[PDB]
Amino acid sequence: LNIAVLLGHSHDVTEREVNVVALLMNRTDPKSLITHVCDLMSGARIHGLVFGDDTDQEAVAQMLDFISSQTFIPILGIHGGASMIMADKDPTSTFFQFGASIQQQATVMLKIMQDYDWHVFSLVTTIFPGYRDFISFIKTTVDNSFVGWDMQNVITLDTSFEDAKTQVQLKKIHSSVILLYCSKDEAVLILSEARSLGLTGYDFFWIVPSLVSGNTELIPKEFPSGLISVSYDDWDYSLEARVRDGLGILTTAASSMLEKFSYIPEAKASCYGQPLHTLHQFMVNVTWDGKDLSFTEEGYQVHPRLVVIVLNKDREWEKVGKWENQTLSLRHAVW
Amino acid sequence: EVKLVESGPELKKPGETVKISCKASGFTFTNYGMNWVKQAPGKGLKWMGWINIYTGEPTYADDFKGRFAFSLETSASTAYLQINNLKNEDTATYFCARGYDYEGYFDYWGQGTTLTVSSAKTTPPSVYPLAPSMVTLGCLVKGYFPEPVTVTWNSGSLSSHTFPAVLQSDLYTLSSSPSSTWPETVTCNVAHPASSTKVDKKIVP
Amino acid sequence: PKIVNIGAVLSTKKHEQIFREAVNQANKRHFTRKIQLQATSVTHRPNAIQMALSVCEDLISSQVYAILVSHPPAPTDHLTPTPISYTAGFYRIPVIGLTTRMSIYSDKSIHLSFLRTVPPYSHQALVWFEMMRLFNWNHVILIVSDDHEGRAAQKKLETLLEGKADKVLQFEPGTKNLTALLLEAKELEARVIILSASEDDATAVYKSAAMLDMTGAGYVWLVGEREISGSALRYAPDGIIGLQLINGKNESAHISDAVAVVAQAIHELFEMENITDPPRGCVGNTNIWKTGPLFKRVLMSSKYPDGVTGRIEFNEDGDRKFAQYSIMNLQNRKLVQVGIFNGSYIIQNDRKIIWPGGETEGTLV
Amino acid sequence: DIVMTQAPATLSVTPGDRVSLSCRASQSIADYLYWYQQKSHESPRLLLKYAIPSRFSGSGSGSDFTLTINSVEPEDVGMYYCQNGHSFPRTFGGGTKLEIKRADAAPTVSIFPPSSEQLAAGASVVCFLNNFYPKDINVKWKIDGSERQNGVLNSWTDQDSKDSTYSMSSTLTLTKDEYERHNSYTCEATHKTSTSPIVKSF
Ligand SMILES: *[C@@H]1O[C@H](CO)[C@@H](O)[C@H](O)[C@H]1NC(C)=O
Ligand SMILES: *[C@@H]1O[C@H](CO)[C@@H](O)[C@H](O)[C@H]1NC(C)=O
């Protein structure tokens, strides 16, 4: 029925145009997230929400999952921090985000390496979330699968110690290909430091997930040229197109909601002051315009619009591959 | 950006009923309590009562029992104060104060609602201008009731002396005060809510 | 004399007074007036949403370097301080739990800004491992619920044995028909059963073992705290050995001990270069506290031996180290302390251990 | 009820000195003692909680509390209350008005005859004495040399927050016929800064 849409100034939003409520929100702080959603829920009985921020804050995703668990409002992360990989979503939440899992990105990364026979590589991570998961899947796949590899062990480090405490750990890498996993904020410090050691040269290959690339519209000066990454922010996948792709996930789930019960759960009274059924059942298997828009109990997208990108010498990202066709990738034959 | 705005000054004859409002804006309303303090002219600060907001539970003081009520409309984010059987001793300025942590200190106050429980005519004032290195001028405002009166010297352009009013036989009277002007020219301004009159004046040599 | 604020979310207005007293005593001892600590605190709000806002408006707005939090069980938060782990975690502001012992807060991927003056229920396997070393047990049976709590207690016990000494059995929680697993256990040929489950899931295992006659004679039941407290205690085998965390429910002691650690970590923090003040409020601030990750690393690396609850050190995931437990043994429907876990060894008490059903032993040698 | 007694209820500290006010409770309020500050015409403002708002310090416990201004600024002139927050009913202290010292300033005297629109209806003579220190000042009206203290209404301004001076408006309220009887109306004044009495007539 009623659906809200909160987006930022990114990718040039102007007028978004069941009933839709749109607003331009460039406050991505905890209170404003709680306020503007509760202020919507009270005074605008929204039954679902499509959110998008212009920041790279991984925590916004963790706040929407918390808000959705308390307001019982289905929230769809579309862009920015709200689509960033986070710990597994709350089982009682209706928060889902357009984003490849850690595992999907890992397979894609390995697929690039297999294409160019990059058997010898190294792994550098921080204690930042996904640090537990990223190595396991990668360590599991290489060890179990039959192919030639040299993990060169795993190098982990803390990006809050004194500089040149990070360096001593860094000089320990002996591989052309290096898998780096951390936050974008951490990545800046790491790559800035590695540049002085000469490890960001073209004789090395730094591959980073979508955690590091973040918004494909904000490139820090410390990111070295020739940085290979996988990301779901596809700057030709229009933000304006995303909400229509996100509205279809809600409307088709709400339509189905009249089947096996003929009533749409009205929005909660108010967040402040002293849920018969969940649309949760109806959103994990949505089909819309030939796009398998489907999610998992973990909350990440089933068919994620992930794209392989590289940082050009002109300081702009550019697509040099594709995934999300089905399983398998489509490199462009240049390295 | 936390602000507490109260309703303006009110005059009600002894025996009537009055309701004052405190509009909350800037904070989570149900996260605090509302405290009501009364200040007679110069007497000091007397705490009237505290009301929890998550639970609409009023807790009045022993001296303010019976004819004092703490209304509450959390949907509009406003706490009210109703006073029945007005006695002349209720002529005071009533504050609303947010209670930090629901029982703690009062970290934010309202601007103050001024109540005058008298029986009088409520007549509008009579503005008389005054005129004779540096030039100082004066604007006399005699014979008005009640006290709440707003005076801006020159369209409010000038901030940076308005004397307190003197009550003598149910009628108030006060007064207010560069050679570069050497009367541009200066015109007086007087306004007041009760008498619904906002006349002006002009100083001429 | 600059000002450094310490946040706190406590349960009662009386505990706030102890918090301000602990900060005051922190300023009398070694503060030297070189840095003045302030005590900003609010009582815990039932509503999760309303609680998360009170952190922003009352705590975060006062530029708090860290926030203390006690969580007794009166209302609405899932009985876990999630709405404050996220709000302060947004700005990497260290949150110090005082009472909550859920093993889910050990993962620095879900709560990357969280510390604990109490150990999780999974770290009770540190006593189980020491008790296996005490009686030279080398073959035990580990029955754990199938959740993140039981999986944590299993992984902690095995990592203490790794650095084939136990066969592990799991079971879907909420079940009241676990006879298939105990039959699996009764043929496993081992007399030492280590159970790790909730108060209700323990009642299911206990009475299901009462049928297969595994509640006495040649069996040894070694458990934690939730398995000897509440309903599970009433259906617990006579001769069972459980654990009771010393000062685990003393909010007042954890308050004065957490403040003592923060103050020491605050002062050694200000002996470093390039420090930024914590964010003044939530609204308008979308980036993390640049000093946050450093200050959390200082808090975990801190060591406070003269704590009122024992030596206060923190784990790699921020959990508390050197926590001392109480080794209880159910004798004639009465829990009897047969010793305590000193923190590095098991102190042998004067009382005698009664095994299930007519034999005796002690925590000696 | 708890009686919060504050003494002395008056102070005149020199600028830059250190103010130390006193609030003694009837019983023991532990640390639940908050401090407030009231500007001249504004709602009281919370200064300290639980014992620029950085020059204020709050020590004390149990039944003896003190608030301390380390370097008194001229914008700190006003009242100071202490509130028992421990036990109902919440009670306040007696309060203490904090005036400050200043350089001896002579008043700016200006007398004004009754307005032409005022005596047309039926004759107040207003006299302004502003921006002076100290506060003690004598004012005498004199009609044709003869002094008259009846019909006089004097109102005083509170001490300025930036200038730290005082002001006063004397008003000789007369009737139309009694005013037209004489023409010599003086507004004399005696002050600490006047060897000769400051006068102004028409
Ligand atoms: C320790 O905890 C118990 C239970 O809460 C309490 O009764 C006791 O007073 C506490 N002792 C101290 C010294 O805090
Ligand atoms: C535990 O007991 C041993 C035995 O003397 C001792 O070395 C150690 O310091 C004790 N620890 C504590 C905290 O008492």
Task: Read off the CATH number of the domain in which C166 is found.
Answer: 3.40.50.2300
User: Does the annotation place A217 within a ligand binding site?
Assistant: yes
> Is the same domain home to D112 and D194?
yes
CB atoms within 10 A of CB A198: 9
**DSSP letter assigned to residue C291:** T
The two structure tokens encoding residue B55: 């639970």
The two structure tokens encoding residue C18: 């102890």
CATH 2.60.40.10 fits B120-205, yes or no: yes
The residue of chain D nearest to residue B160, with distances taken between CA atoms, is D162
> Is the same domain home to C257 and C236?
no
Contact B108, B43 (CB under 8 A): no
Pairing of strands A286-288, A291-293: antiparallel
User: Does the annotation place A9 within a ligand binding site?
Assistant: no
In the beta sheet, which residues pair with residue A230?
Answer: A308
**Radius of gyration of chain C, Cα coordinates, nearest whole angstrom:** 22
The residue of chain C nearest to residue D59, with distances taken between CA atoms, is C24
Which bound ligand lies closest to the C-alpha atom of C342?
A: 2
> Is the same domain home to D15 and D40?
yes
> Is the same domain home to D92 and D107?
no
Q: Tell me the CATH number for domain B1-119.
A: 2.60.40.10
**Radius of gyration of chain B, Cα coordinates, nearest whole angstrom:** 20
Collapsed DSSP state (helix, strand, coil) of residue D97: strand
CB atoms within 10 A of CB C223: 26
- The owner of tokens 């794209």 is A307
In the beta sheet, which residues pair with residue B81?
Answer: B20
> Is the same domain home to D94 and D146?
no
Best of B30, B52, B57, B73 to disrupt the A interface (most A CBs within 10 Å) is B30
Listing from the earlier edge strand, what are the strands of the sheet with B126-130? B126-130, B138-144, B172-176, B166-167
Integer Cα distance of C41 and C59 in angstroms: 7
**DSSP letter assigned to residue D159:** P
Query: Residue with the nearest Cα to atom 6 of ligand 1?
Result: C250
Best of C56, C78, C80, C109 to disrupt the A interface (most A CBs within 10 Å) is C109
- The owner of tokens 């705490």 is B47
Integer Cα distance of A127 and C215 in angstroms: 44
* List of E strands, C147-275: 166-171, 192-196, 220-222, 241-245
Which of D45, D108, D168 is opposite residue B136, by nearest beta carbon? D108
Collapsed DSSP state (helix, strand, coil) of residue D74: helix
Question: How many A-C residue pairs are in contact by the CB < 8 A criterion?
Answer: 82
Distance (angstroms) between ligand 2 centre and the Cα of C240 equals: 26
User: Does the annotation place A233 within a ligand binding site?
Assistant: yes
**Is some CB atom of chain D closer than 8 A to the CB atom of B150?**
no
CATH fold label, A1-99+232-304: Rossmann fold (3.40.50)
> Is the same domain home to C263 and C293?
yes
Which structural domain range is residue C103 located in? Answer: 1-119+252-323
Q: Is C252 in the pocket of ligand 1 (CB under 6 A)?
A: yes
**DSSP letter assigned to residue C153:** H
Cα-based distances in Å from C9 to B6, C53, C73, C90: 31, 12, 14, 17
Q: By C-alpha distance, which of C333, C334, C336 is closest to C351? A: C336
Which structural domain range is residue D38 located in? Answer: 1-102
> Is the same domain home to C56 and C183?
no
Query: Residue with the nearest Cα to atom 7 of ligand 1?
Result: C250
Best of A160, A186, A218, A268 to disrupt the C interface (most C CBs within 10 Å) is A160
Question: How many C-D residue pairs are in contact by the CB < 8 A criterion?
Answer: 5
Contact C295, C271 (CB under 8 A): no
> Is the same domain home to D77 and D7?
yes
Structure-determination approach: X-ray
CATH number of the domain that D71 lies in?
A: 2.60.40.10
> Is the same domain home to C208 and C59?
no
Amino acid at A149: W
Angle at D81 between CA D76 and CA D84, to 5 degrees: 145
Integer Cα distance of D190 and C273 in angstroms: 63
Integer Cα distance of A165 and B115 in angstroms: 69
Integer Cα distance of C106 and C315 in angstroms: 9
Contact A182, A56 (CB under 8 A): no
The residue of chain D nearest to residue C36, with distances taken between CA atoms, is D57
Cα-based distances in Å from A99 to A108, A204, A314, A317: 14, 28, 27, 19
- In this complex, do A271 and C49 lie within 8 Å of one another by their Cβ atoms? yes
CB atoms within 10 A of CB A116: 11
Contact C18, C256 (CB under 8 A): yes
- The owner of tokens 């005519």 is B121
Which helix (H) or strand (E) segment is C312 a member of? strand C312-314
User: Does the annotation place A11 within a ligand binding site?
Assistant: yes
The domain total for chain D is 2
Non-local CB neighbours of C306 within 8 Å, separated by 6+ positions: none
Amino acid at A140: T
Which helix (H) or strand (E) segment is A49 a member of? strand A49-52
Query: Residue with the nearest Cα to atom 9 of ligand 2?
Result: C344
Let me know if the fold of B1-119 is the same as that of B120-205: yes
Q: By C-alpha distance, which of C141, C139, C136, C131 is closest to C165? A: C139
The domain total for chain C is 2
Integer Cα distance of A49 and A279 in angstroms: 13
The two structure tokens encoding residue A102: 């850690």
- What class has domain A100-231+305-335? alpha beta
Distance (angstroms) between ligand 1 centre and the Cα of C250 equals: 6
Non-local CB neighbours of C203 within 8 Å, separated by 6+ positions: C231, C232, C235
Domain positions in chain A:
1-99+232-304, 100-231+305-335
In the beta sheet, which residues pair with residue B175?
Answer: B140
Integer Cα distance of C224 and C327 in angstroms: 9
- In this complex, do D30 and C39 lie within 8 Å of one another by their Cβ atoms? no
Chain C hits for D60, CB-CB cut-off 8 Å, are none
Pairing of strands B200-202, B172-176: unpaired
Chain B hits for A273, CB-CB cut-off 8 Å, are 30, 54, 74
- In this complex, do C39 and D31 lie within 8 Å of one another by their Cβ atoms? no
State the DSSP string of D123-147. Answer: -EEEEEEEEEBSS--EEEEEETTEE
- In this complex, do B161 and D43 lie within 8 Å of one another by their Cβ atoms? no
Contact C224, C323 (CB under 8 A): no
Domain positions in chain B:
1-119, 120-205
In the beta sheet, which residues pair with residue D61?
Answer: D64
Give the closest-approach CA distance of C48 to chain A in angstroms: 8
CB atoms within 10 A of CB C281: 16
Please tell me what resolution, in angstroms, this structure has.
3.3
The two structure tokens encoding residue D79: 């009242």
**DSSP letter assigned to residue B152:** -
